[PDB]
Homo-oligomer: 457 residues x 4
């Protein structure tokens, strides 16, 4: 077992632990969710401390002795080694200092090991002065967040690009199938199933464009802002360097933000991304609700489509297939939305030079992106691609629908057709037979006028 | 065009206008929605200034010649006269001072008229010193709000009490009608339409109880808190009196809040009411969505019920009758909810001794209660009461339904019924006719097992 | 008094009223808020019915007799005449049919008058068959909404462009004033007031760009979609015409949307705009909260700035100036946000070929835009432009702040300065005198190192 | 790697695993958050399956040899053994069937072990037929949730009861300390720090009462509703028993809900609790924001109080101690609220006889209650109890404060004090020293008028 000390006092650290006291304080201070910070944040945090070491060696302020040990340790965390040592709670006080410190304390103790030394020999490698040199919480943490968010969004757009492709196929596959369009859930006018799926396809096209764009503002990073944006204690040479390194390390077209005070106090890049995602899920939640409708049944329901069975839907009803893949999408949407409200609240709570609510914000932000990526992947494969149509059921609905009379409207007028249609719904007779009862159009005119393939117009 | 002044400068007031400069400033300062403050708040504001005058006369500090003129003017605003004059915007800066002052400047100029003077002759009847004596914005405005909110809530509960009665009838009416219960929209086991409507009836019973309770905290009023809650420069005798009067005037069992600092800085009474309403509308929005489904018609949908036509549903489709009464309920719910978020935000934004966001809060609060009361009234009368069943459509679904096999399960055993169920799904034949094809059960027996009542009670249908 | 009839029955219309029965039904059916539909929607509705008349004459299906009377009536409503006759409730059932009908019934009865005839002579001019020809609720109403929303957004961006200009001046004006940056509300490091106002200026720059972009999707309009998107009962010639007219009439670069089924069932254009606005107000609500802080006082408070007095702030405290212009901005933000939640809910509730919740949606959407435009206009003039600084109070804060020791950190190290800073806060002595007590830097090194104008970095 | 099958096909289960195929499917189907379902739900799930076994033995329909093995396995999960095995994702399709089945497949395979068999030997102990007898997803899962929610709420109220005690002490401690009340952040009239803390104390008192009440509706449980609420194929004797057992097992005064259709389709019990919590956190988030203000320090801010340092506040600024305990409260509030929106959305999305969104609902609900209980515990101990006052800083603000003129107003009159107040603002001198400069009041008199207690009670400070 180790022992370490701080203003507050002395603390017993497990000897296996690469994490230090400031992390131990925060695990005691903020036992809130007991989740762990997103994996992709840890990776990003390591990329930053590395670029920071690299830059501090380039400006001959950090000894290459220490910096290379740090760089070595970073590279391992980047590779995915020491994640289990990041143990602070995503929901935490101190504006994300206890996250920054968790990285500082782990990268140090593992740079020690790599110098052959032992953990807690902070003398050789110092969390504050060496790992975190030229840096504050207030530039490292967000710069990480920016890179994390970007990586996840890029995963998202891949998954969505695939999802769009999936819907697009079903557009083509179902293009020739005729069905009843519904409006207020009331039977309206003929439409082809495939036109509905094109509709889905295009809203998704748009979601992709909006989420793509949300990234633009993230490419700007506040590195070398230090405390407030003033960039005190940072050498412009370090600032120029640490960015180029971050650009190389990350593989992202990052750029120093033109105003550092601005990029340090404003959280609008995040609210913007969340906003784009919320929109996305509103759309998808709807499309989900549609599929669940059309798949209602299989007898006392619309029964226009069928979705791949993925599990026994019920515990007591034999032969129960529930639309569970859509359902999960619905539920995800409810998350993302609720998360947006958290994000927004947090974004607003900012005061003067710093927003201290960044943690819960980022927790929800990153969560939102991940959840969607997962939901979409499973939904693309397990449900969407496997959707099948009941054309005979769908054609039947057309053949027994008053609503076809919307085609006889420009010859007979809305008033003469409204009365024929009110009579047909009540008596339950075909529209054709009530047009021959009133003798309002001829039979050879009805064969033409009341022909279902009027969707194309 | 009369001229008035305050420590900022001078303004031209129309001479017709009973409202003063501080109101003019606010109409310039906050031209935001250009709505007018709720009618029921104006009434309440007048009730308060009246109780305040009455109390200030009773403690021999306001001259009876001025107070009675004020009381007279209040009584008219209560009766519904001078509402046109209230012209400040519900969304406004200043924590609701510009509302308080719009009541002060109108009650004064009309108490003037009533004592034979002319408007603007403030020397005699003073907005600040007389109308608003023993009072701050921070006690008059909320105390009004509390009375307003209570009156509207009481209208609401009457409307809902009536709505629950409406649903309850449809529970009884539809009690014998059998249909397919749905689960994930998939066909499950039989249920009677009336059981669904009892479900609606009871959630509403509960909504009523929650909204009823939300009122408790409103009965406490902070009158005589003055600026901050310390109650400084206000006489306990005035505080005791002004409450007593407000109780008589309003009709409500109001009580001075035990802690005035508390009742002046905390807005939790309001967030509490909103909360109760949000819950209410979640439930109703659901019930609405149900009805819209069950009325999916005319042919390509469930078609289990029909809701009264109230208008031509569509402009181009002949014969379209839409569930527009339910639809409006859905839309209201979305408001109430969004409003709760506004309310909550505003309630949280409080700092130290005062919450300055009370206006938008109250705007949304009062709006929510009103729009609900209205939505419910119209929905009760023009939809719920007029709902009818398609019992032959509903019974048909049962008769051609696989899930019915759960009811004849204990008399055939799981093995023999697993095969009858797999056969009925494939062939698509009724399970009754597959029970006498196999001749596992008698016709009389099947009458008793596939009884509307028997398939839908706890027990084994035997 | 007039009398009119429909399936439901006979109705007594005031004789003065240009509105018909279908409007009377809806005023009875939906006595919800008793507001009136936005003025700018009425204007838009008229622009549409006009383009529709014009197009129906061009395709020689509407008699020029009737159409020109309609066009005449439209032109007056456009000019702002008959607004008082639009009396249906913004929150209403029927997906916005009762709005469409209110226009139909007013434009007809006023086209009658302009033919010398009398109201209720629907025989001459028919609400359904003539005013509303080639049209459904489901294309007229949204196409209007699209034009309304665009006009209001354009007003908004003007107002905001002006607001940005206002902040930008204060950036320059306050550039030389030094103050204490605060972080978690704790005193941190020097910053210039003007850097704070640049921060405000740039977040606003960004808001403008996002709101500008939100418009793109609105330019696409679904005109000639009719019921469902299929475009049944609409002649492609009418479709081509009615757009070009709408483009000319409106003055907007409108375009027929590539898919009509898509633009008829998806409400993502609206959720997108709301989203952009919500973000905007999060930012502004913050900036507002900042100003109210810095203007706290005037004695027991920060007292770094002063805002124009705009009214007696209090009823009993003499000499009370409250930051009421900022406060109203805060309150507006709370609206816009809550409205976004309404909009989103409504947008999601869509089912199959139509979203029937469009009304409350549009009510909140249009409201949001208007409220902001108003709030911003008043806030730009009445508060922002008049903001004044208390430099002597702000300089004083610098001169008595431990936080200046962040500048002596790279020479002394974080550990030696953390102890000097913990001692100075407790004892309340200057940092200089505790650096000469420890003799850790010379006096000529402190004159340089602890010099406040380190913000520039 | 054992092999299992159901009507979809075959799967390879690790042999270590007590979980079955239906759980494996769901872990594949719903790899969403990769969180695990709350611990307290697992406990509850086990309590239910136990009461269910017990009841099915008591009604002579489950063999005692299987039931006791089940009961044994439940008791272990209750005791906290087999939680590792619960592996389905809180956010999942299927309305919480995959949770029910994860309990069924684990309790079975471990009841097997306990009757000497091997896992996968379902013949003997069957997930569906035995573990889940007399039960559907739609009664077991919610009944669990109800018990879970109750247990966490009871932890919450203990924590809050303690929190209110904490604030209440600071009310007493700080009762004599005078400071400037603020209004719109502008200086107003004197108030005592302790009055502010009593305000906090009482809002919390009220939060407790609201959360207490939210529980009432949870005590009603839908056990024996089976699929839809009709309760078909479940024996009233089982229903009477299984409740009785759940009451003993859980400790809670549970009761069979009068209407089972109602308690099966309505989710208003949950929206009600969330609502109460949201209100709570609005209040706390405010109180938090207050404390952060008053602790704005060290020099360039209010500096009226100090909160216990709990960590180095900053990484680059030496000496930075931040109000991190309050900050965490703020952040929690934002969660709870956002979660309420998720909950509400989900509650509304219900259709007809079942709400299939119950999982995300419950995930957020349970999360909200937990994170609150934790936030409060740590905030009570590491912040509230350790708060200290800067009474000389606070008294100084009073002594150099214009608003103090409201207190010496009745003894000088409005005319003479209007001029002393305009002079004190300009010159910046204390109003006490301007009262003896003009010699309008004696020093002894000023002691009594500018008394901490006198400036802050109802009355006239004389």
């Amino acid at each position: 077992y180790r022992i370490e000390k701080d203003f507050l006092g002395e603390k017993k650290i497990p000897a296996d632990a690469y994490y230090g006291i400031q992390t131990l304080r925060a695990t005691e201070n903020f036992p809130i969710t007991g989740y762990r910070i997103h994996e992709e944040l840890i990776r990003a945090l390591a990329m930053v401390k590395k670029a920071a070491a690299l830059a501090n060696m380039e400006t001959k302020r950090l000894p290459a002795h220490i910096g290379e040990a740090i760089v070595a340790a970073c590279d391992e965390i980047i590779a995915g080694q020491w994640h289990d040592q990041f143990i602070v709670d995503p929901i935490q006080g101190g504006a994300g200092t206890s996250i920054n410190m968790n990285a500082n304390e782990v990268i140090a103790n593992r740079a020690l090991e790599i110098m052959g030394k032992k953990k807690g020999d902070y003398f050789h490698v110092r969390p504050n002065s060496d790992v975190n040199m030229s840096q504050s919480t207030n530039d490292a943490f967000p710069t990480a967040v920016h890179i994390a968010v970007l990586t996840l969004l890029d995963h998202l757009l891949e998954t969505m690009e695939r999802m769009r492709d999936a819907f697009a196929e079903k557009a083509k596959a179902f293009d020739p199938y005729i069905k009843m369009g519904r409006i207020h859930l009331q039977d309206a006018v003929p439409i082809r199933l495939g036109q509905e799926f094109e509709a889905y396809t295009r809203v998704i096209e748009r979601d992709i464009q909006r989420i793509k764009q949300s990234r633009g503002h993230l490419y700007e990073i506040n590195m070398g802002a230090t405390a407030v944006g003033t960039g005190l204690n940072a050498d412009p040479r370090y600032i120029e360097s640490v960015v180029k390194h971050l650009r190389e390390i990350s593989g992202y077209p990052l750029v120093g933000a033109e105003n550092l005070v601005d990029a340090t106090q404003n959280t609008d890049a995040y609210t913007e991304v969340s906003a784009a995602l919320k929109v996305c899920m509103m759309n998808m939640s709807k499309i989900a609700n549609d599929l669940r409708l059309m798949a209602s049944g299989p007898r006392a329901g619309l029964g226009e489509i069928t979705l791949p069975a993925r599990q026994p839907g019920s515990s007591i009803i034999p032969g129960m297939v529930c639309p569970v893949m859509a359902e999960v999408i619905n539920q995800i949407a409810f998350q993302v939305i609720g998360n947006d409200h958290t994000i927004c609240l947090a974004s607003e709570a900012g005061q003067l030079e710093l927003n201290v609510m960044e943690p819960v914000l980022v927790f929800n932000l990153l969560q939102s992106i991940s959840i969607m990526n997962n939901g979409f992947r499973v939904f693309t494969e397990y449900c969407v691609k496997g959707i099948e149509a009941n054309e005979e059921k769908m054609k039947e609905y057309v053949e027994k629908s008053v609503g076809v009379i919307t085609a006889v409207n420009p010859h007979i007028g809305y008033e003469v057709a409204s009365r024929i249609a009110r009579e047909a719904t009540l008596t339950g007779q075909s529209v054709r037979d009530l047009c021959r009862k009133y003798d309002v159009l001829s039979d050879e005119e009805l064969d033409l006028i009341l022909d279902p393939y009027e969707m194309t117009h």
